[PDB]
């Protein structure tokens, strides 16, 4: 059963992959070797070209991603050679450095050894390589509430945050054969942060808001032709609304809209004043302005939507079915001002793709 | 087959309806009479209580409606007695008057005779009883483009618009037995209009924007226990975003965002300035302010969402399944600032309900 699913996913992937690479004639022989390799070993190993292209296809198939136009320029780092926690750590440090690229963000994925018998070689606990801790204790809310459980897990392992609203969580991952994960503090020189200012409201800096430059999702599983890369952190650059409309605005996150309303000089008393909507816009303008000012890559949601339209058009020209999750593709501000809002999308799941997996903590 | 579907829908409706009315014991006898009435006549007639409650249930089941909290206070006007186009016209004029209620809008439905053999007694052509005409001719865009086809249909019947951006379309409907519909100009004294001004931007009036007070959907079919009320115009009051974020903002409607950006003193050159988002907010503030200032009922989307949350809670307390269309329930501005955005809904279709039907024109 195991070696049957694998073989089926493998046949489908290699055919489609090699077809796109213009290697359709090499399929039959590559499929022969794979069939033999599965029978004998219970698995198979991707060539560098397959792995690289598989990661790109997986991005292209991510229904919830608005940034998919640039799927083919993904920078793929092959780290299937890693065997030690020192190597994992340095691969993670390197990923951060090369993706950040002094602010000129390179979309990048580092790929670690895949599961074998469903047994993980490396198990990364971070949701993102760079994220802020969160504390909920006795009425005191500090930091990012989304990070409360992971934070408490780290602190259970000997780490201690300074309890500012922006403590950088340590990298934390577990190697096959260890009962506990290990954790390593992040070198500050590797992490770019953007203080949030407003282009024309000077008081906005009184909020003392900031965010990190690069969102590096590190807890999703990459699936390519039956092979499960459970550890494969990837990053793009932020769309402004992710920070301005959700991370800093959600009541269950940093919940900053009342303070934004105050510094921008408007009352926050009446729903009919639309003070939340107005606060949202100024905060989102502030986020875009601040990232641009520091030279850190970011895209506004209109530009991103225009890009996604091109992705839609390219999909049709290439004869590929387009798949998408309308509920995630629409931006959380002014969605009706994008074309996305006014059409529908097929939410079917196509592989290769990125998937959720269970949290080891919690 | 016909008298079978009818009987089945009837059994389900009467049971549920009488149960909610506390008349569960009268069910068996009422069901007996209905069964006899169907066999002999090919149909059956709702009592006033059934019709009234059916219309309320249909509102309650409208997955796309955020205003459903007030389902039980719907004012139901029974006009199944109408036989002439003069009576239809006066019933439509009356509906407008009583729903408007000097600005203190009463949610209201006027119910006309139902289809018999699928044959319509009355066929209303308007999408809303009060709407603006639209003209598309030789580069010239005038009025509401959503009304272009109906407008051209009216003008094909002898009506002529003045070709302002806000020509009121005539009422237009067809009686069973006539090849053509008839049309009647709307008395201006019956129609409340709201000039759009801004609470603190005086130049906003230079736009010369306005809208009508009461949205009265007149082209949907009401289905109650197998009986098809194809003509049953209903109204609530507007949610501000319907006017500010869609009717006046959509590129395929009045497309006013550039002119809004100009009068509010901001540039409309860069996506990163979020000028559309900012323009949207000021226009939507202007809409709410203007309706409030004239004493015409309106609800902002935050208040409406809070009300819908209560509807959700009442549904659970009453033991009723909740159904909803997430894609329509989320407001087109700041959707993430509402609870609706952060939960999901079952989009199943429950009857009684309101349904689309084919346009006789176009
Ligand atoms: C290049 C810049 C990129 C931008 C601007 C972008 C934009 C976005 C946004 C806005 C979301 C929604 C996230 C949320 O609502 O929290 C998203 C989701 C997603 N993106 Fe991208 N993205 C980019 C690059 C990438 C890359 C490089 C990958 C992987 C190779 C990727 C895969 C995904 C996936 C898998 C999701 C959905 C995650 C989930 O279901 O939770 N994206 N993207
Ligand atoms: C009391 C005030 C009401 C408010 C504020 C309200 C609000 C809304 C809104 C905002 C929509 C979405 C419309 C759009 O996006 O264009 C909607 C849809 C709808 N509402 Fe309501 N509504 C109200 C009363 C009513 C009443 C009285 C009925 C009927 C008895 C009704 C039935 C519906 C239906 C059927 C739809 C969906 C129509 C479609 O699919 O095109 N609503 N409502
Ligand atoms: C934590 N998950 C189980 C749920 C969840 C909640 C909130 C956000 C996400 N994914 C965010 C996400 C994922 C991939 C991204 C890629 C690029 C980018 N700019 N943002 C991205 C953002 C996922
Ligand atoms: C014209 N239809 C085929 C599609 C369509 C497009 C745009 C809007 C609608 N329905 C709008 C609608 C329907 C019922 C409403 C009830 C109350 C209210 N305030 N707005 C309401 C608005 C329907
Ligand atoms: C329940 C709700 O549909 C769901 O949580 C979604 C809605 N759309 C979203 N869209 C984005 N981009 N991100 C999110 O976290 C969500 N939340
Ligand atoms: C295609 C798209 O999903 C669809 O046209 C919907 C989206 N959500 C909407 N929501 C509302 N309230 N009104 C609309 O007309 C639409 N359009
Ligand atoms: Cl994030
Ligand atoms: Cl409308």
Residue B329: count other Cβ atoms within 10 Å of its Cβ.
21
> Residue A272 is nearest to which of B257, B292, B326, comparing CB atoms?
B292
DSSP secondary structure string, B283-326? HHHHHHHHHHHHT--EE-HHHHHHHHHHHHHHHHHTTPPP---H
Domain-embedded: residue A165:
yes
Q: How many domains does chain A have?
A: 3
What would you measure as the largest C-alpha separation in chain A, in angstroms? Answer: 71
Angle among Cα A205, A208, A213 to the nearest 5 degrees reads 100
Q: In sequence order, what are the beta bridge partners of B219? A: none
Residue B325 Cβ < 6 Å to ligand 4: no
- Whether the bond into B52 is cis, omega within 30 of 0: no
Q: In sequence order, what are the beta bridge partners of B142? A: B135
Contact yes or no for A231/A15 (Cβ under 8 A) = no
Q: How buried is B129 (Cβ within 10 angstroms: 0-12 exposed, 13-18 middle, 19+ buried)?
A: buried
What 3-state class would DSSP assign to B168? strand
Total length of chain A: 362
Chain B neighbors of A260, CB-CB under 8 A: none
DSSP class of residue B176? T
What would you measure as the largest C-alpha separation in chain B, in angstroms? Answer: 71
Do B65 and B85 share a structural domain?
Answer: no
Buried b (16+ CB within 10 A) or exposed e, A243-255: bbbbbbbbeebbe
Tell the residue number behind the tokens 């009036």, with chain if given: B205
Do B203 and B147 share a structural domain?
Answer: no
Contact yes or no for B352/B222 (Cβ under 8 A) = yes
CA A58/CA A220 separation, integer angstroms: 12
Angstroms from B260 CA to nearest CA on chain A? 14
Sign of the dihedral through C-alpha B196, B199, B204, B206: positive
CA B280/CA B246 separation, integer angstroms: 10
Contact yes or no for B225/B10 (Cβ under 8 A) = yes
Cα(A326) to ligand 1 centroid in Å equals: 14
Contact yes or no for A144/A168 (Cβ under 8 A) = no
Q: Which of B52, B61, B62 for mutating ligand 2's site (highest number of atoms within 8 Å of CB)?
A: B62
Query: Helix/strand/coil (H, E, C) string of A278-293?
Result: HHHHHHHHHHHHHHHH
On whether any CB of chain A is under 8 Å from the CB of B334, the answer is yes
Ligand 6 atom 16 nearest Cα = B328
DSSP class of residue A211? E
Do B297 and B179 share a structural domain?
Answer: no
Half-sphere exposure of B73 (CA within 13 A, CB side): 9
Contact yes or no for A87/A110 (Cβ under 8 A) = no
Phi, psi of A298 (to 5 degrees): -165, 155
CA B339/CA B266 separation, integer angstroms: 31
Buried b (16+ CB within 10 A) or exposed e, B10-40: bbebbbbbbeeeeeeeebeebbeebeeebee
Residues 6+ apart with CB under 8 A from B20: B53, B57
Contact yes or no for A148/A134 (Cβ under 8 A) = yes
On whether any CB of chain B is under 8 Å from the CB of A58, the answer is no
How many beta-carbon pairs under 8 angstroms link A with B? 94
What 3-state class would DSSP assign to B163? coil
What 3-state class would DSSP assign to B24? helix
Active-site residue set of B: 65, 68, 237, 242
Domain-embedded: residue A335:
no
Do A272 and A312 share a structural domain?
Answer: no
On whether any CB of chain B is under 8 Å from the CB of A257, the answer is yes
The kind and range of the H/E element at A15 are helix A2-21
Q: In sequence order, what are the beta bridge partners of A184? A: A171
CA A50/CA A18 separation, integer angstroms: 8
Domain-embedded: residue A184:
yes
CA A278/CA A271 separation, integer angstroms: 11
Which atom of ligand 6 is found nearest the CA of B64?
A: 12
Q: What is the CATH number of the domain that holds B111?
A: 3.90.340.10
DSSP class of residue A170? P
The kind and range of the H/E element at B195 are strand B193-195
Contact yes or no for A245/A277 (Cβ under 8 A) = no
Chain A neighbors of B335, CB-CB under 8 A: 330, 332, 335
Q: How buried is B258 (Cβ within 10 angstroms: 0-12 exposed, 13-18 middle, 19+ buried)?
A: exposed
On whether any CB of chain A is under 8 Å from the CB of B278, the answer is yes
Half-sphere exposure of A287 (CA within 13 A, CB side): 27
Q: Which two tokens stand for residue B238?
A: 């507007």
The kind and range of the H/E element at B16 are helix B2-21
Residue A245 Cβ < 6 Å to ligand 1: no
Domain-embedded: residue B254:
yes
Phi, psi of B228 (to 5 degrees): -105, 100
Residues 6+ apart with CB under 8 A from A247: A144, A211, A253, A254
Residues 6+ apart with CB under 8 A from B155: B161
- Give residue A237's region: left, alpha or beta (phi > 0; psi -120 to 50): beta
Asked if A245's CB is within 8 angstroms of B271's CB, the reply is no
What 3-state class would DSSP assign to A343? coil
Residues 6+ apart with CB under 8 A from A8: A226
On whether any CB of chain A is under 8 Å from the CB of B277, the answer is yes
What 3-state class would DSSP assign to B92? helix
Return the CA Rg of chain A.
22
Contact yes or no for B309/A298 (Cβ under 8 A) = no
Q: Which two tokens stand for residue A252?
A: 């269950």
Domain-embedded: residue B344:
no
Q: What is the CATH number of the domain that holds B160?
A: 3.90.440.10
Q: Which two tokens stand for residue B274?
A: 């979020």
Asked if B333's CB is within 8 angstroms of A272's CB, the reply is no
What 3-state class would DSSP assign to B118? coil
Q: Which two tokens stand for residue A301?
A: 């949601």
Cα(B238) to ligand 8 centroid in Å equals: 8
Angstroms from A167 CA to nearest CA on chain B? 26
Do B229 and B113 share a structural domain?
Answer: yes
Ligand 5 atom 12 nearest Cα = A328
Ligand 1 atom 1 nearest Cα = A236
Tell the residue number behind the tokens 């009883």, with chain if given: B129
Residue A301: count other Cβ atoms within 10 Å of its Cβ.
30
- Name the pairing type of β-strands A171-175 and A210-212: unpaired
Domain assignment of residue B267, given as a range: 193-215+238-303
Compare all CA atoms of chain B with the CA of A288 and give the residue at the minimum distance.
B272
Domain-embedded: residue A350:
no
Q: Which two tokens stand for residue A53?
A: 């292209």
CA B253/CA A253 separation, integer angstroms: 36
Do B209 and B145 share a structural domain?
Answer: no
Q: Which two tokens stand for residue A260?
A: 């934004």
Chain-centre distance of CA A333, in angstroms? 20
Do A250 and A282 share a structural domain?
Answer: yes
CA A78/CA A113 separation, integer angstroms: 9
Contact yes or no for A142/A135 (Cβ under 8 A) = yes
Do A112 and A230 share a structural domain?
Answer: yes
Asked if A276's CB is within 8 angstroms of B285's CB, the reply is no
Angstroms from A53 CA to nearest CA on chain B? 32
Asked if A278's CB is within 8 angstroms of B337's CB, the reply is no
Q: Which of B138, B99, B164 is nearest to B151 (CA)?
A: B164
Cα(B238) to ligand 6 centroid in Å equals: 16
Domain-embedded: residue A348:
no
Do B130 and B228 share a structural domain?
Answer: no
Q: Which of B71, B75, B219, B242 for mutating ligand 4's site (highest number of atoms within 8 Å of CB)?
A: B242
Do B128 and B231 share a structural domain?
Answer: no
Tell the residue number behind the tokens 């990661």, with chain if given: A55
Angle among Cα B116, B170, B98 to the nearest 5 degrees reads 75
- Name the pairing type of β-strands A182-184 and A171-175: antiparallel
Domain boundary among A287, A303, A319: A303
Sign of the dihedral through C-alpha A203, A205, A209, A215: positive
Residue of B281, B283, B338 to mutate, interface with A, max A Cβ within 10 Å: B281
CA distances from A152 to A135, A155, A159 (A): 8, 5, 9
Compare all CA atoms of chain B with the CA of A325 and give the residue at the minimum distance.
B327
Q: What is the CATH number of the domain that holds A281?
A: 3.90.1230.10
> Residue A292 is nearest to which of B245, B272, B337, comparing CB atoms?
B272
Q: Which of B172, B63, B60 is nearest to B107 (CA)?
A: B60
Half-sphere exposure of B287 (CA within 13 A, CB side): 27
Contact yes or no for A211/A247 (Cβ under 8 A) = yes
CA A200/CA B266 separation, integer angstroms: 12
Do A126 and A164 share a structural domain?
Answer: yes
Tell the residue number behind the tokens 């109408």, with chain if given: B82
> Residue A276 is nearest to which of B249, B276, B334, comparing CB atoms?
B334
Compare all CA atoms of chain A with the CA of B332 and give the residue at the minimum distance.
A336
Do B298 and B243 share a structural domain?
Answer: yes
> Residue B276 is nearest to which of A288, A289, A334, comparing CB atoms?
A334
What 3-state class would DSSP assign to A339? coil
On whether any CB of chain A is under 8 Å from the CB of B303, the answer is yes
Contact yes or no for B272/A239 (Cβ under 8 A) = no
CA B243/CA A304 separation, integer angstroms: 26
Which atom of ligand 4 is found nearest the CA of B356?
A: 3
Domain-embedded: residue B340:
no
Contact yes or no for A332/B336 (Cβ under 8 A) = yes
DSSP secondary structure string, A53-109? HHHHHHHHT-TT-TTGGGGGG-EEEE-TT--SHHHHHHHHHHHHHHHHGGGSPPPEE
Chain-centre distance of CA B329, in angstroms? 15
Total length of chain B: 362
């Amino acid at each position: 059963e195991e070696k049957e699913i694998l073989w089926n996913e493998a046949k489908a992937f290699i055919a489609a992959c090699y077809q796109e690479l213009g290697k359709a004639a090499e399929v039959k022989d590559r499929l022969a070797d794979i069939k033999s390799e599965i029978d004998l070993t219970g698995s198979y190993v991707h060539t560098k070209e397959e792995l690289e292209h598989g990661a790109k296809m997986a991005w292209r198939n991510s229904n919830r991603c608005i940034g998919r136009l640039f799927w083919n320029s993904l920078n793929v780092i092959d780290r299937r050679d890693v065997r030690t926690k020192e190597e994992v750590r340095d691969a993670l440090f390197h990923h951060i450095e090369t993706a950040t690229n002094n602010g000129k963000i390179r979309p990048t994925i580092t790929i670690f050894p895949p599961e074998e018998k469903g047994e993980k070689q490396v198990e990364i606990w971070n949701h993102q390589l760079i994220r802020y801790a969160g504390y909920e204790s006795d009425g005191e809310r500090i930091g990012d509430p989304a990070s409360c459980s992971l934070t408490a897990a780290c602190e259970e392992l000997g780490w201690r945050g300074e309890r500012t609203d922006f403590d950088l969580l340590p990298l934390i991952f577990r190697m096959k054969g260890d009962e506990q994960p290990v954790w390593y503090e992040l070198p500050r020189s590797l992490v770019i942060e953007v203080p949030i200012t407003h282009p024309d409201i000077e008081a906005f800096s009184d909020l003392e808001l900031k965010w990190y430059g690069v969102p590096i999702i590190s807890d999703m599983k990459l699936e390519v032709g039956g092979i499960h890369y459970n550890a494969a952190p990837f990053n793009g650059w932020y769309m402004g609304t992710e920070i301005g409309a959700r991370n800093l605005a959600d009541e269950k996150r940093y919940d900053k809209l009342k303070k934004v309303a105050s510094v921008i000089g408007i009352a926050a008393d009446y729903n009919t004043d639309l003070w939340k909507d107005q606060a949202l816009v100024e905060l989102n303008k502030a986020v875009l302005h601040s990232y641009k000012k520091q030279g850190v890559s970011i895209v506004d949601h209109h530009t991103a939507a225009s890009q996604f339209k091109r992705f839609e058009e390219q999909a049709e020209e290439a004869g590929r079915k387009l798949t998408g999750d309308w509920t995630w593709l629409i931006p959380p501000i002014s969605p009706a001002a994008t074309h996305i809002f006014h059409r529908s999308y097929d939410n079917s799941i196509v592989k290769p793709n990125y998937f959720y997996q269970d949290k080891p903590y919690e």
